[PDB]
Amino acid sequence: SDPKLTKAVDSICDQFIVTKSKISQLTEYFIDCMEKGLEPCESDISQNKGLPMIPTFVTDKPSGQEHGVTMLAADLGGTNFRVCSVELLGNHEFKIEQEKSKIPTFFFQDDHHVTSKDLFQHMALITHQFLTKHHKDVIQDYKWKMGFTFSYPVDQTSLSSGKLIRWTKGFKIGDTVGQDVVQLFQQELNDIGLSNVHVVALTNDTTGTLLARCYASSDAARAINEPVIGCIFGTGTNGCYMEKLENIHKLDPASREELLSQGKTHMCINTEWGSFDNELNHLPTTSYDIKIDQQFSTNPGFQLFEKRVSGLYLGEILRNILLDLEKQELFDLKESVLKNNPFILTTETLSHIEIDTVENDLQDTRDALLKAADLETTFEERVLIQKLVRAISRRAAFLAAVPIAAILIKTNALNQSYHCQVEVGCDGSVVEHYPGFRSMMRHALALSPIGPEGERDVHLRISKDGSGVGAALCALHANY
Amino acid sequence: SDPKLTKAVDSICDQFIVTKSKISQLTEYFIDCMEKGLEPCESDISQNKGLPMIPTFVTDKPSGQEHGVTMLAADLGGTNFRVCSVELLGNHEFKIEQEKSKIPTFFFQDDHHVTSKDLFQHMALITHQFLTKHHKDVIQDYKWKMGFTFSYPVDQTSLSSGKLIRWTKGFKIGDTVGQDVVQLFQQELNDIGLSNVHVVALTNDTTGTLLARCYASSDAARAINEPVIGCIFGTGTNGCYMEKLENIHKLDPASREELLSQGKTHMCINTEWGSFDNELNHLPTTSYDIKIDQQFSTNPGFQLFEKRVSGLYLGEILRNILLDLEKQELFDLKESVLKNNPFILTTETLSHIEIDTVENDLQDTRDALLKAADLETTFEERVLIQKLVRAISRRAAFLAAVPIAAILIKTNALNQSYHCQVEVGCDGSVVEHYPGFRSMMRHALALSPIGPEGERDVHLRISKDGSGVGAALCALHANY
Ligand SMILES: OC[C@H]1O[C@H](O)[C@@H](O)[C@@H](O)[C@@H]1O
Ligand SMILES: OC[C@H]1O[C@H](O)[C@@H](O)[C@@H](O)[C@@H]1O
């Protein structure tokens, strides 16, 4: 046992603590950033470093009674692409067939130049494969309507149009920025004989999650828990909510009055809260966060909240900590492959360490670290690595509660009726599968200004239904 | 409006308040009663006024991988009888066919003499009708094993034997007390030609609820939430938990060592917490509670906790309050049928009042009161009636949390591993369908000694699986 190392680890773990006062600060600051983000854009939307707060042009929360013929949906996430067909049967029920495939590594590597046509041709081809397998008899005949879930910031101009503001996560395809992604996708669909497939809706994965929960929640369950947020804690992190039209001052005033006259009162806002406090005025920041933001990430200066929370980055934080402890001659990295191998340690690796037990000599930690980077470890080394992992994930979970607390506070969502609660629909591998992440989120909600009595009125529900149902709901509404 | 009536109602509502100090007192007192209840009693088990704390002789929580041929199950509740066949397919999955039938009124009336043979003959015929409908080709051939879920206190002597301690709810069949209900049931099965149906297990509906959740809970869901309590909040209320063998002092000391030598460490305990504090040393008590216990209930002096909590009695509490307000010449009962009609107001009636809205002039309340007893009401009267209902249900929900907090504290269940949470499997119409009952239970848990941090670690989950899966699991284990 090396006491000098144990004290160094304990001091690093302390850096990741987020106090109740910090949660209070970040909550009020987040609301401030929400209000500034709702004001008319000063600079160019692609270079604006504030909270994006992007109007989605979705104003109606599904009732659950929507019904229609089979819709198509395509969902480009941070890690996978999936095509599915959704049949909305009404009465909160649907039939879904889907195919999920990992985004080929070719699209995340910059060694060779990659273009938008490569990506959307690949997406179009998989769409063809899907229709061949599940709808072989009507692939080329039917007038398919498709909803496109695009989990990236888009300068939305209507339900069916919007230009990519900037890539996030692992994408760095240059020529896509500033282009309408619905058109890029439609062109590649046309060129392989699927011109009968009309992409008629474009949604963020947050928007789709909220719409899907509004539909599938039973009349009884929804009368108790009204869905008010659709958010994501997977490869990246983000969330949406319903904002009063009058407060969306960046929206064209005449368009606002038109919507208000039509009976609409709110529009869904894609906060893009991964880019909360990109200037680091208040977010906790360690030396490891700086190296991830400035050297190892594809988007330096953006998505900084996300770089402390989402699954793409938690494992890389551990890597930067271990490299620092080895530079100080406190931790022996052996013949591992950690050096010069960014993102080799994944959040999935960490998920095997979070609740590993010392009664098993932390063997899951031993096996997981050997599999990821061939890092052999002693028991005392694993004990200390577990302390670090638990500090990284707790900070991620505590920060994860801040945007939710802020939205609920700003919209006075908890001021309801007797026995009335709100649902926060959550999707993504971290919130769903990382041991304890949700529990720690709820702790941070209880420390937040909404208090423990507020946390009990909030239900973080895993919406594994998917944003495909949400995209399908938008396609049902739209015209072919 | 009516100031004198408003002040009387507001004063009654205050009498139903349960404070944090009371919850703490009742929680610690409940633990004391658990410990006294685990000591060997020498008195008549039917006359003991303490917490029964009945060993169930169930020592093994299912793994979820249990599999076998189709088992039978019989479930006598407080309101319905159901027979069902359960096919355990392993991997937390099962196939179930069931038939549910209401217990005939004949068994709840005392005008005509009722005997155990009447009850168990009728159950034998229903079992025959079930096997004729769903297993017509092997009714008389197969060597059926049946699990018997009997939701009443039983002096359990093995998994397959136990004498009725006393009826509860609406049952008062005299000659059943002191008789092995498995033998009574088996005799009538033999006597209608179903001697090939062997009743091989006898469980309380609490025990069955816990065993069912242990089986159906996925390995992943169960690794985060370990089921530690199976409880009921329906017609009656009760719960079970796993107690260390060493603490079950009423068990034969030699039998304890035999079980311990076999690798067993715990045995499920049927607390029978409906009979918590039958002597009213600390339970809140109103004049209305006394009238229910001494005049309108079948079992005066027993099940007093239950008579403040469970669905059989909540509506009757309101009736007795209105009769007192009419006795005081403050409320006009008009031409209603409340007088001399005990239990005419049901907990179902109250469920329509709990979340009725003034925006509808409380029309759900008006219709529910007219449907039940032809009680015409004004809007201002309904405003006050709603306050009474909300006071009755909150007191029920707050008291409902006390046994759960007590069990978790006694067994030190919430602080076991990092990220440690527990599942409390709840079944019954009240907890499942009464608006806000679970929400208010969680409030009371947070006020209890486990605190808000404890409540966040407790998952009150609705167990719609049923005690049939639980009974089937016991029958699969048992020998034909
Ligand atoms: O995938 C989650 C989330 O990741 C990033 O933060 C952004 O690309 C968002 O648009 C997206 O919703
Ligand atoms: O049915 C729930 C519960 O009701 C009463 O309290 C008793 O009959 C218990 O034996 C039973 O478990």
UniProtKB/Swiss-Prot annotation, chains A, B:
It comes from the Eukaryota. Residues 63-203 are annotated as: Hexokinase small subdomain. Residues 204-465 are annotated as: Hexokinase large subdomain. Its EC number is 2.7.1.2, 2.7.1.1. Gene3D superfamilies: 3.30.420.40, 3.40.367.20. SUPFAM superfamilies: Actin-like ATPase domain. Residues 3-476 form the Hexokinase domain. It catalyses: D-glucose + ATP = D-glucose 6-phosphate + ADP + H(+); a D-hexose + ATP = a D-hexose 6-phosphate + ADP + H(+); D-mannose + ATP = D-mannose 6-phosphate + ADP + H(+). Residues 145-171 are annotated as: Glucose-binding. One of its GO terms (biological process) is glucose metabolic process. Keywords: ATP-binding, Glycolysis, Kinase, Nucleotide-binding, Transferase. It is an enzyme of class 2 (transferase). The keyword Nucleotide-binding applies. Belongs to the hexokinase family. This is Glucokinase-1. It comes from Kluyveromyces lactis (strain ATCC 8585 / CBS 2359 / DSM 70799 / NBRC 1267 / NRRL Y-1140 / WM37) (Yeast). The lineage of its organism: Eukaryota, Fungi, Dikarya, Ascomycota, Saccharomycotina.
